[PDB]
């Protein structure tokens, strides 16, 4: 009557199983990274130049006010 029934793989087998290493490269050359670093350094230098010159002028103005008030 009944037939044999046990754990067997399905007909046609199972699908392929990935086993190879997969470590993809994110991707950016060293030249590009160094250029980005130097560029942001230069931008910071320029902004600091302008801001510190303005600060020098402001300090000179304050010193002038003190000089006027001194006598």
């Amino acid at each position: 009557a009944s037939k044999v029934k046990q754990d067997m793989p399905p007909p046609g087998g199972y699908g392929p199983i990935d086993y190879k290493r997969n470590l993809p490269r994110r991707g950016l050359s060293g030249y590009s990274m160094f250029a980005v670093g130097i560029g942001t350094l230069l931008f910071g230098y320029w902004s600091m130049m302008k801001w510190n010159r303005e600060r020098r002028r402001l300090q000179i103005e304050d010193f002038e006010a003190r000089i006027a008030l001194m006598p």
Partner: protein
């Protein structure tokens, strides 16, 4: 049949040397590990709520 696990030779041209130096001086693989841990942070944990939840068993 046998495989070689650590039998690679780095290329000595200027571009590859610059890439290795950039990795050394900017810590690229360290940020890669940081990013993988960050990605792992944003997924569901595997913790069940014992004793209100139970692990699977068999007959």
């Amino acid at each position: 049949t046998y495989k070689f696990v650590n039998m690679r030779e780095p290329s000595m041209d200027m571009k590859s040397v610059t890439d290795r130096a950039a990795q050394t001086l900017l810590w690229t693989e360290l940020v890669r590990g940081l990013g993988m841990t960050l990605s792992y942070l944003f997924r569901e944990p595997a913790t069940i709520n014992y004793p209100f939840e139970k692990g699977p068993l068999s007959p």
